[PDB]
Design a protein around this nucleic acid. Structure first.
Ligand SMILES: [Zn+2]
Length: 58
DNA sequence: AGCCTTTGACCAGCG
DNA sequence: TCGCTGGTCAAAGGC
């Protein structure tokens, strides 16, 4: 999606099967992080973005 | 070296 | 207070 991310965890939530993976924008000081649930088919079923990139893309 | 993913255990916050 | 649940740490390993 055009940004750089570093994974920092994966948990298995309630009700929804697919596990959830947490990532953090790797830009210096950038605080955006996101959480991701993908289907068994590898399709994005849910993305939460928590912040906004005060920087340009790479 | 430096950066990433995996993994298991710890944090908090709310009911 | 307790303990489940989602969010995070950080070590151990891979690249
Ligand atoms: Zn960013």
């Amino acid at each position: 999606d055009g940004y750089n991310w570093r994974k920092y965890g994966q948990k298995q939530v309630k009700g929804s099967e697919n596990p959830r993976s947490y990532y953090k924008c790797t830009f210096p000081n950038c605080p955006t992080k996101k959480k991701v649930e993908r289907s068994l088919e590898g399709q994005i079923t849910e993305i939460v973005y928590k912040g906004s990139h005060n920087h340009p893309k790479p």
